[PDB]
Design a protein around this ligand. Structure first.
Ligand SMILES: O=C(Nc1cccc(Nc2nccc(Nc3cccc(C(F)(F)F)c3)n2)c1)C1CC1
Length: 256
């Protein structure tokens, strides 16, 4: 039975959705971890307790080198506390704005690691549906880790905009092919420095996503163009399997 008294709190890592994440050390063992603090009142108001419950259930039970481990949880009067694996090298989000854009080797490596992780998730009937750079963390060896499971629905079939597929914004039926779409958007954003449907406006981004209207800058190689164009199909059925993505020649040539 964990309590706040069991941990020494350190620097704030991030300022989060429903509260900050802190660096923490467990007192007995000196184990370094991340403490995600969520405010109950704000969870009530947003009405996302189910998604939190699913998140907790999913992340505690899944075991993958490219998925951030969840060790446990506890609460008090005002807060819920998530006890998380600490990822030393931060978010791919910060990494992206620091480097501006990624080279093909770094990108294909990240895509490989994500595809492996999502392939595992999909085999356990878990669909992420909230994949984006700020939910992607880097471990001590720079290995990509899915940070959490977001505030999405995770069932095999269900019904910023930048990372959501056309079937999800149009209120249509959506499945595991959502994560393939997200993989296409990430691959584009990694190479270009911005997501393919980015706009100054929500209403415009919505239009871009629905029309699937994006263009490549000249420096995007044909192998990269081929994978991305395969992933960003309007019709989910047309999107490749994660298995095909892992075998794609551009991935093979460039991934570590
Ligand atoms: O800042 C550094 N590293 C760093 C920044 C931010 C986060 C981490 N690690 C980490 N490990 C486990 C979990 C998290 N979670 C987390 C990190 C950042 C933001 C949020 C959000 F937005 F959900 F609150 C959650 N972060 C590590 C240091 C320069 C390299």
């Amino acid at each position: 039975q964990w309590a706040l008294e069991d941990f020494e709190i350190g620097r704030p890592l991030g300022k989060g959705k429903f509260g900050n994440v802190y660096l923490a050390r467990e007192k007995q063992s000196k184990f370094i971890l991340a403490l995600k603090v969520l405010f109950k009142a704000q969870l009530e108001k947003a009405g996302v307790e189910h998604q939190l419950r699913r998140e907790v259930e999913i992340q505690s039970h899944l075991r993958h080198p490219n998925i951030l481990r969840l060790y446990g949880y506890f609460h008090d009067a005002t807060r819920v506390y998530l006890i998380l694996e600490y990822a030393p090298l931060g978010t791919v989000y910060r990494e992206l704005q620091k480097l501006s854009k990624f080279d093909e080797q770094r990108t294909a490596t990240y895509i490989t690691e994500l595809a492996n992780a999502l392939s595992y998730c999909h085999s356990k009937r878990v669909i992420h549906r909230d994949i984006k750079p700020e939910n992607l963390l880097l471990g001590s060896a720079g290995e990509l880790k899915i940070a959490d499971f977001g505030w999405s629905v995770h069932a095999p079939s269900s019904r910023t905009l930048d990372y959501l597929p056309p079937e999800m914004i149009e209120g249509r039926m959506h499945d595991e092919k959502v994560d393939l779409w997200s993989l296409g958007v990430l691959c584009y954003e990694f190479l270009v420095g911005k997501p393919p449907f980015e706009a100054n406006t929500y209403q415009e981004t919505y239009k871009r996503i629905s029309r699937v209207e994006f263009t490549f800058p000249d420096f995007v190689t044909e192998g990269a163009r081929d994978l991305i164009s395969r992933l960003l199909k309007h019709n989910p059925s047309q999107r490749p399997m994660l298995r095909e993505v892992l075998e794609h020649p551009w991935i093979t040539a460039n991934s570590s």
